[PDB]
């Protein structure tokens, strides 16, 4: 019941946000499933290092998306208001499935 999907690029801020969510809902009772980590999206970009005629030397980059999942077993409309009104860091987004 009540899904919370957290996505960001830094696992430190992911973990901090998940801890804040779970400690908030708990402060409002509502027992909630622990933050379960989904597989991290791993996009890879290869780029010719030089601006011209040098293809054998290249640079690789990744955009790792870290995802965590929270279940709010207890309905608790007070926790509903809390989870819609609290503030989260800009780097992480929130997805609430009612």
């Amino acid at each position: 019941k009540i899904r919370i999907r957290l996505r960001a690029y830094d696992h430190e801020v992911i973990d901090s946000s998940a801890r804040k969510i779970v400690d908030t809902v708990t402060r409002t009772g509502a027992k909630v499933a622990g933050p379960v980590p989904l597989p991290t999206e791993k996009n890879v970009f290869c780029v010719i290092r030089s601006p011209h005629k040098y293809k054998d030397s290249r640079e690789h980059f990744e955009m790792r998306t870290h995802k965590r999942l929270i279940d709010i077993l207890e309905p608790t409309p007070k926790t509903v208001d809390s989870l819609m009104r609290l503030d989260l860091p800009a780097g992480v987004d929130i997805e609430i499935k009612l």
Binding site: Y9, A90, G91, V92, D93
Partner: protein, 206 residues
């Protein structure tokens, strides 16, 4: 010619990204507006001296941290210049901009402002050796553990290009735990432009 950018090398390890937002269907357009914001701010606020522009987004609302040595230019008189630059920012982007301007505690220790000053002196036609020595001495008076400055180009208005450099202390570029601040600027002279690069070893971090 073959050296990596220190900031990119230490990105994620010790230093952090200048932009903090998440978006997976608009990523390109947010990148474009960020580029527009940064170009506009750099082109219209040279006088203040920009260490960094840090961009955050929550929901169609953008937040700009402007790390400047002298925010007097940015704030103008009683925030008039701050209001006008914010208004130009809404005009440029179309979103709600919350702009805040922060000091740099040690401008003589921040590499980007050091490159700013060295390039300004070179443009004002100060002897490059004297400028580099002054910047180096000021950095070590502040208390940096290592300075390295390199000016490349038609130094002194000459014809051939040189790559004159100064350094003392320790600047371990190869060490990832080493906190190395990197700055770069271009002195626009009557003879092309001079590239000034500055590495400053702040210390060691975990």
């Amino acid at each position: 010619g073959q050296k990596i950018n220190p900031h990119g090398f230490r990105l994620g390890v010790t230093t952090d990204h200048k932009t903090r937002w998440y978006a997976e269907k608009q990523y390109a357009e947010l990148v474009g507006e960020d580029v527009k914001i940064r170009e506009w701010l750099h082109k219209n606020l040279e006088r203040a001296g920009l260490s960094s522009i840090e961009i955050e987004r929550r929901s169609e609302r953008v937040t700009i941290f402007l790390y400047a040595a002298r925010p007097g230019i940015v704030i103008g008189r009683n925030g008039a210049e701050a209001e006008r630059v914010r208004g130009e920012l809404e005009k440029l982007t179309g979103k709600q901009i919350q702009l805040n301007i922060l000091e740099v505690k040690s401008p003589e220790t921040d590499a980007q402002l050091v490159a700013q000053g060295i390039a300004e002196q070179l443009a004002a036609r100060v002897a490059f050796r004297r400028a580099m020595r002054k910047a180096q001495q000021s950095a070590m008076n502040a208390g940096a553990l290592g300075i390295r400055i390199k000016c490349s180009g038609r130094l002194g208005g000459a014809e051939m290009s040189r790559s004159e450099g100064y350094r003392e202390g320790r600047v371990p570029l190869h060490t990832l735990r080493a906190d190395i601040d990197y700055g770069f600027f271009e002195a626009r002279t009557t003879f092309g432009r001079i590239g000034v690069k500055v590495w400053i070893y702040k210390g060691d971090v975990t």
